[PDB]
Design a binder for this molecule. Sequence first.
Ligand SMILES: Nc1ncnc2c1ncn2[C@@H]1O[C@H](COP(=O)(O)OP(=O)(O)O)[C@@H](O)[C@H]1O
Ligand SMILES: Nc1ncnc2c1ncn2[C@@H]1O[C@H](COP(=O)(O)OP(=O)(O)O)[C@@H](O)[C@H]1O
Ligand SMILES: Nc1ncnc2c1ncn2[C@@H]1O[C@H](COP(=O)(O)OP(=O)(O)O)[C@@H](O)[C@H]1O
Ligand code: ALF
Lengths: 459, 449, 441, 142, 38
Amino acid sequence: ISEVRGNTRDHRTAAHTHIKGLGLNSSGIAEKQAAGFVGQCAAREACGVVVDLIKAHKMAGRGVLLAGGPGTGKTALALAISQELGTKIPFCPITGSEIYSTEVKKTEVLMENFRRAIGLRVRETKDVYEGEVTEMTPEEAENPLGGYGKTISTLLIGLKSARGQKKLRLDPSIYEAIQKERVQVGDVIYIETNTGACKRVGRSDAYATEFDLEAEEYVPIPKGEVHKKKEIVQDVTLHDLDVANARPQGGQDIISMMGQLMKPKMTEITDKLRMEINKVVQKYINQGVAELIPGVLFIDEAHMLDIECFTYLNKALESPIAPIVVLASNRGIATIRGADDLKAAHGIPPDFLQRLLIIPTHPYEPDEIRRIVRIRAQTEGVQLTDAAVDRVAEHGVRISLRYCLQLLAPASILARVNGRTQVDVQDIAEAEELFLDARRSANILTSTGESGGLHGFIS
Amino acid sequence: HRTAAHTHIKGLGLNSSGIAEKQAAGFVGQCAAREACGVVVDLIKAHKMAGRGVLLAGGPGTGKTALALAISQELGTKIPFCPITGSEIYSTEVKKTEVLMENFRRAIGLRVRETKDVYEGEVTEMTPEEAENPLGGYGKTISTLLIGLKSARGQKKLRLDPSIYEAIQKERVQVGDVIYIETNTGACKRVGRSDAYATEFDLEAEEYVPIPKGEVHKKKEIVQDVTLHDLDVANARPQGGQDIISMMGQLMKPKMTEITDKLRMEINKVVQKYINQGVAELIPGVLFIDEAHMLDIECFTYLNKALESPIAPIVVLASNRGIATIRGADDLKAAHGIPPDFLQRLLIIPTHPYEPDEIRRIVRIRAQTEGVQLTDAAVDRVAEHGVRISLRYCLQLLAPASILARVNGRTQVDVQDIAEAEELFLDARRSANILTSTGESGGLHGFIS
Amino acid sequence: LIAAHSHIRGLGVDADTLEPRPSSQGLVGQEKARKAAAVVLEMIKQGKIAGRAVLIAGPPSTGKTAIAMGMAQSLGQDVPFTTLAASEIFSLEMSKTEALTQAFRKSIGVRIKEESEIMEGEVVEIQIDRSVTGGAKQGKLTIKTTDMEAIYDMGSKMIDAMTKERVMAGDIISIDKSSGKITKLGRSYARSRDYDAMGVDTKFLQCPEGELQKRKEVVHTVSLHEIDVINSRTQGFLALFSGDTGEIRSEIRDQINTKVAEWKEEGKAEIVPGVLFIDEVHMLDIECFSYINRALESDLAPIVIMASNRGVSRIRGTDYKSPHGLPLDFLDRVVIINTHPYTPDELRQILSIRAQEEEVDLTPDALALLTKIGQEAGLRYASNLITTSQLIAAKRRAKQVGVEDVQRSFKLFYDPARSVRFVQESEKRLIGNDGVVDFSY
Amino acid sequence: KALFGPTPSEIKEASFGPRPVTLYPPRALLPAPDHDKQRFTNITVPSMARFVTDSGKLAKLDELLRELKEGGHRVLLYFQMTRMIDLMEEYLTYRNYKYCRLDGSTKLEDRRDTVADFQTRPEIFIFLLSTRAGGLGINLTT
Amino acid sequence: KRPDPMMIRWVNNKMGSVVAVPEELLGTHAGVVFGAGP
Ligand SMILES: Nc1ncnc2c1ncn2[C@@H]1O[C@H](COP(=O)(O)OP(=O)(O)O)[C@@H](O)[C@H]1O
Ligand SMILES: Nc1ncnc2c1ncn2[C@@H]1O[C@H](COP(=O)(O)OP(=O)(O)O)[C@@H](O)[C@H]1O
Ligand SMILES: Nc1ncnc2c1ncn2[C@@H]1O[C@H](COP(=O)(O)OP(=O)(O)O)[C@@H](O)[C@H]1O
Ligand code: ALF
């Protein structure tokens, strides 16, 4: 049906594709450049302890602040933390701007993400019989019931898979499932042993040629064993348990079915539900059938949170089940987003800041900027003459790190369209002239928009 | 049983002449205000008036809310007393002027005679009859049900319309059940099984009930108390029919709606029929808007028209504020926080601070109300607060002091237990000093500004 | 997990004298405030008095939440203790007034008793009849003790339960006849061999003895709010949990208040009034305070406890300041508890409890240094360094947290005051309140 | 039709047909009521527990008869009103108490029989008994 | 009493279980599962 593309796979490169980890010794000391990082040895070592905090299940509701100017690698450090944890531990990134939902109060939006950052791992065994129905045969009973004339003591079903077939002897009550489900010979079904009922996947595509037209799609014969008994490990967040309880999905009545045909509007999940969910979760943890695996809620531009968000986070972080929260901020001393009379450092209320482990991120030396240019070039696949490297690094000292990382691809285009397989000073000197930085542009504004005028900028 | 701020207030404590006894029904003083509240009770009990406004005006803790709750007791249970704060008016579902109208009509009551015309019996037969419709695609439809009802002194066979069969069906009625049917609403209730065949061995946990005594068909009469707002809500969210709109209207989430003047006017016509039919007594009541300074200039400008309505309750406002900015009208200051052209509409009952001997009396009334047996030196101690501190701070100390005395093994509170209560539990002013002295400079241990 | 207050296991007072011990049940110091909270706790338990507002006041830290969490532990599970952050009240689904009304009514329990009746026996036989093409079902259960056999008729709801539970002969089952729930307790017979897919060979049990029916007195506690939600509705009682409930009409509450009183007079219910704890109470608006002040005055009002960090501070929604940021005519109705910042030996004792709760073996000099840090950086920061130094010690395989680990932790992680200096030392490179910044070296 | 489901003749036709047929809708799509006892109406039925507790005399009598029954104390109840001894046996038949009745409306041979019945067999627990018609002459020494 | 025309009956006991089918359903589609269709 679909025409599979045989062409080679490759990965897009984004602003942080070069970062692969925190780059630490087994002693936890930062290597001066490793895993894509250059410098920030203090902040990487601190994040390494935070990583070991998260992997140790004693933590609940601790707070971290990544504090430092724009460009200083706070986003890179958060992503590196996430990569050090890996996919088995939740990392839930948001900005403060995402909390201003129109659809529920923002303390609900934040508590959703707070519970998204908390994972639950449940182990259960799946136990089914599974195949194409090869036969159905009633076993007439030894002692029939009077007045009925028919009495069946067993129904026998043949199931085949790709890997075998079995004669299956079933309690005759399965007649109810077969008759409702309209199971026929050549249909693919499974029998689940916790009910003894059956469900029909479809007709086996071995029968796809029975007619010139039949109104169903066929399905392949199951490629497993005819009997499955498997442990299954389910990734669950506690937010999944919130929604699954607060809006049940499978309801067969008109109001349920009309509900599932209309937009699944968020609702202000009660603390009573969440607190009972916690109690049943803690029960199953004590049974040992589930693991709690708290992860990371990361809030970037946390200075976009307002004082109502921060005061709720006080209560939230005090929960006995809670992720770690990592905050990033760049806002100096600034007015609290929802308390116009109050200024504080980082734009974080002094009440709340006292809870956080602050990690400072510092600027970069000229030689670190150069090393970052080397790492970024080989990641985007660009290759530079050393004089192009030094010119890119020089703009990085004079203007900004980000601006210079953004010159690499434009200059690579200009090089290849000039027939050069590597970029040189002539291309950098050309990329930097097509693509201005904010300062040179602001100078054009300041010179041209000194007044109103037919060709003036507008203000 | 539980003791609250006003549990000692029982009434206005007036003489039959309408003069206030200086200490009666739980009050001390406010005599002129209690006498004015008496004349307001007379204005309410005489049904003749609509839309008169009263303002209780006076500083916090002068008993304005005690006066309003005393009115609520002198009126008794029959008359509607509808208390709200001005902060209840800001709904998220409907405009704030809707909430005012709902409260205006909640404050007008109706007592109405109702005849319930019903069938009751053990279901002895139930036999549906149906038609093959033309091809509408939904298939066959039940045209009617035939149902046999047996009572102790008769039986019927009823040929039901199929909308009553849907009531019967959604009530999960079976043969051998005892059921009740209202011809008023078409509604059905399954009362139980018969006490016949009441074998214990059902998992179904049935209530077996006796056969209805009397005839199958009955026409009982009962007296219902309702407000005008109860009628508004019933007719705006219809739910008493067996039609599809009434059916689905029970499955949808309940939500308030901006009931139109058109509906309210036509319910006046309906209720006036009940009056002319002699089946209803109109009993207008009172709306108490506490904290009326929390209303805004749109609320107050609506109240102009609402009070001019040819039926409206009496409105009692209370405010505790001096010359203050009108909310929603930061350009306008007025006394009481009430717009000056609305204040013209009201009769103002000014309410005054208590004297030190009145405070002593209130402390003793309040102590014995809470069951705090309390020595006279201890009374004098508590009553030196209320003079030097708010009156409320006196009354709030009585419960801690009782606990501390009982913990000290005393049968009764001495001055010592109050002097400990004074130390554990500060007034606002002593706490305000702690703030200003500790927050005298910033730091790790400072209070946050 | 270990949370901020997980060591708090009570208020730490002598139940007879209400005298605070200098350290017990995980609380330390605050003796005046702990005694005051113990008198409040006693008048909570006594139930007699309604609508007392108690404000706990103090600087940040100094245990105001810890005291309130100590109170909650001392009440136990039975008395309602509704924690509310004042920022929860600003719902989009309901007004602040309605949100407060629900928070009050969540704090009053109705404790309702019923005589359930239960069956327990071996299933000897099951018969089920099913209408082809659905609709009606019928059946009989034959169920046994050592002493009885009886045959019970079954309806559709019970047959749904029986088939969902996959009840079979030889199962021991119990049936709560009042709710209709079934539980399989085990089996008396072996699991058969004639059929496949029969599932789990559940626990063996001997047959139940005695009579099949037994009465069972059971007691359930429900809030006034939970009675509100199901009585404002025909359908959709999941709004108890999803929070879909709108602004419930006051006619419903007035009826419920009347009927719950009558249920108390009938002896059907006990009212168990509990606590509403409003933390960060300074975050409410003037409109909220002018609701609480009169909501308190009702006979069904809970006891309301509050905490505030604020000094003489602006009231939200208005132009002016007040003590605690709370209106004066509100504070008129409040008795105020003041907490006081800890001494170094109080800091040392708290940090020892935090260390023991986290199971961290501090060396004595590390506890001394953490105390010195506690005096100057703060108790929360000094607490954060305990779990951090434990991790650093584990990197070097140290069996105890040494001074080197606390110094290493102090180096890696800044306290608030040091971070404020770091901000002031980098005002050029951080984003200012003017939005200006310099990105260059 | 969607809410209340397939019609009974349609169920018969579908179940007796030679080949399966899919009904409309094909089931009742009306939800289950959340209140398992109040269902879809606002009609209330007075409980007999409410009948006991809405009289202070009867609430106190109910406790007393319980203790008396466990004591084996066969007991005579005197009423000044005939309508009350009617209501009393509605209560006594809601409970399991075996009772008999004598009042001024019972006919003379019925009075002999009830008096001799109660005085014969200990099975009867409560003699419901009118003050005037039952108060004189008879012997109730058991 | 002769059994209902359309209630198919399942019964389970120590001997295992059986399904019994009304004589009225044999020769209907509901008989096909039992070997007794039209
Ligand atoms: N120490 C570092 N080593 C390598 N790359 C870095 C480092 N710090 C920042 N970068 C890269 O330079 C850019 C600026 O860092 P970023 O984290 O975006 O700054 P901010 O913390 O202000 O968001 C990003 O593309 C990031 O991947
Ligand atoms: N004249 C009075 N006699 C007895 N008790 C009073 C009197 N005035 C006020 N109180 C009591 O003092 C307390 C505060 O009065 P309150 O009515 O709350 O004042 P306001 O409502 O004007 O703030 C209440 O418990 C009230 O019952
Ligand atoms: N007296 C105390 N005893 C034990 N732990 C305390 C005490 N006071 C504060 N703490 C702890 O210090 C931290 C901050 O105290 P907290 O009560 O949250 O302060 P706040 O009153 O500002 O909420 C919490 O982890 C708390 O457990
Ligand atoms: F005097 Al009598 F029965 F008591 F005749």
